[PDB]
Amino acid sequence: QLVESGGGLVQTKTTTSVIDTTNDAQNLLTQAQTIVNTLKDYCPILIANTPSWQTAGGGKNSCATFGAEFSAASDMINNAQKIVQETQQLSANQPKNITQPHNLNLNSPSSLTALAQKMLKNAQSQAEILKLANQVESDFNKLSSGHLKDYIGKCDNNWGNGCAGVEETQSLLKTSAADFNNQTPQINQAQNLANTLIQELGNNPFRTSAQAINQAVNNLNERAKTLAGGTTNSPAYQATLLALRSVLGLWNSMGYAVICGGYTKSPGENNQKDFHYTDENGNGTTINCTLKADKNVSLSIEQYEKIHEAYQILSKALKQAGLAPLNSKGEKLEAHVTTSKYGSLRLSCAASAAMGWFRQAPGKERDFVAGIYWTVGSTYYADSAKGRFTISRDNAKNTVYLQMDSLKPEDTAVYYCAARRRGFTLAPTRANEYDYWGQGTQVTVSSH
Numbered sequence: 098q099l100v101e102s103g104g105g106l107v108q109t110k111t112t113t114s115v116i117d118t119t120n121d122a123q124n125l126l127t128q129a130q131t132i133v134n135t136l137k138d139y140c141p142i143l144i145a146n147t148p149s150w151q152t153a154g155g156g157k158n159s160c161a162t163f164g165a166e167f168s169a170a171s172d173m174i175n176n177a178q179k180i181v182q183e184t185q186q187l188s189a190n191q192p193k194n195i196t197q198p199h200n201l202n203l204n205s206p207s208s209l210t211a212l213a214q215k216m217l218k219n220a221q222s223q224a225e226i227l228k229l230a231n232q233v234e235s236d237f238n239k240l241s242s243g244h245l246k247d248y249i250g251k252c253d254n255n256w257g258n259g260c261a262g263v264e265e266t267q268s269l270l271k272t273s274a275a276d277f278n279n280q281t282p283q284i285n286q287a288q289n290l291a292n293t294l295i296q297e298l299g300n301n302p303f304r305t306s307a308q309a310i311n312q313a314v315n316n317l318n319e320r321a322k323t324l325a326g327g328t329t330n331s332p333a334y335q336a337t338l339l340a341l342r343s344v345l346g347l348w349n350s351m352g353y354a355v356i357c358g359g360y361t362k363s364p365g366e367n368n369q370k371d372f373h374y375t376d377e378n379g380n381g382t383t384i385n386c387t388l389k390a391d392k393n394v395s396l397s398i399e400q401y402e403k404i405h406e407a408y409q410i411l412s413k414a415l416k417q418a419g420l421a422p423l424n425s426k427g428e429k430l431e432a433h434v435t436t437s438k439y440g441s442l443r444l445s446c447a448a449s450a451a452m453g454w455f456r457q458a459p460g461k462e463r464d465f466v467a468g469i470y471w472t473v474g475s476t477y478y479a480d481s482a483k484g485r486f487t488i489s490r491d492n493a494k495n496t497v498y499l500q501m502d503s504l505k506p507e508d509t510a511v512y513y514c515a516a517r518r519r520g521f522t523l524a525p526t527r528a529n530e531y532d533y534w535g536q537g538t539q540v541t542v543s544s545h
């Protein structure tokens with residue numbers, strides 16, 4: 098009479114990527130950038146004890162609530178990227194010392210002008226690195242003052258809280274930046290000395306001892322060494338680390354609340370993907386990804402994939418390898434990126450006025466799932482099925498189908514196809530309104 102097919106255990110795919118990367122600043126800054134740029138450029142809507150910003154901006158797109166936070170985070174990464182580039186400048190301009198000032202075979206006017214030029218490039222780079230480092234601190238205050246005041250610095254499910262060590266590095270940055278601002282006259286005294294040399298040793302178309310200059314070269318070189326290769330004492334390293342810890346903190350504080358999974362290919366698509374997050378201590382969470390993915394509405398699964406991958410690299414790098422000194426090549430890092438997804442199912446039912454699908458769980462009653470009208474092909478769905486399941490019928494084959502998308506373990510039950518030959522006013526949704534029943538087909542959903 099009614100014979101079901103298409104049941105069974107739904108396919109589960111668990112995919113793990115092993116990313117062999119490095120802890121060098123430029124690589125980490127690119128990961129931080131992926132996270133902040135996708136957020137400030139595509140503004141996804143925020144999901145409607147919960148935080149202060151969530152009540153205010155729930156259903157109200159990000160960028161309206163976190164526009165200042167995203168701008169602060171973006172500026173921190175851009176300025177840290179400039180710090181990394183200036184530390185490259187700084188490493189390329191290391192002035193050498195004067196050996197035997199009395200001898201002028203080697204201590205030539207061309208050599209001293211070349212010495213003064215480097216002192217000039219080196220001093221100017223130091224000034225720019227420090228300027229940028231103070232601006233990252235300024236941009237951090239802008240980030241830590243708004244909605245995320247109570248959250249970004251705090252940590253104790255860890256979602257909603259910073260958990261990035263942003264407070265510890267702000268303090269080390271303030272102390273490092275202070276010491277470097279104390280040594281400003283000494284880098285001024287080397288800068289004017291270099292400007293007097295380029296001038297004096299220069300051509301005159303109209304016709305400050307060696308130790309003192311060696312003092313200036315030694316001071317510049319020692320300061321530059323700590324600025325480029327230092328950690329605890331470098332405001333360059335602390336500013337770049339604060340930028341990295343702030344983006345990680347930004348994602349931990351509000352990333353869970355971002356709407357993801359908007360349709361790219363076509364509306365109502367089995368794209369649903371679970372993104373796995375692991376905290377230290379092994380506390381694992383998973384974020385799941387019906388509307389079009391577009392700016393100010395949603396994030397496509399590809400967009401979330403790229404944030405999730407950047408986050409895993411950034412997290413592992415910051416948590417377990419640390420940031421490598423700005424002038425060092427950087428050590429290897431192995432990051433793990435895990436995602437999972439369930440397959441779809443298509444129940445079929447061959448018969449030989451209305452046809453429906455029912456589900457019954459162990460010990461629980463027969464619940465209506467979906468129904469279809471025999472001539473018109475009008476369909477009705479139970480609230481559980483609505484949007485996920487689709488009922489259809491092949492008039493010719495006298496078959497009814499149930500496309501099952503967006504499956505979750507809760508859907509595990511025996512699925513029955515049912516038929517009513519007699520007429521009706523109100524669409525039949527109760528089991529007593531159906532006269533013919535199929536054998537039943539077990540459908541099993543479970544996480545790996």
Ligand SMILES: [Cl-]
Nearest residue numbers: 521525529530
């Ligand atoms: Cl009836």
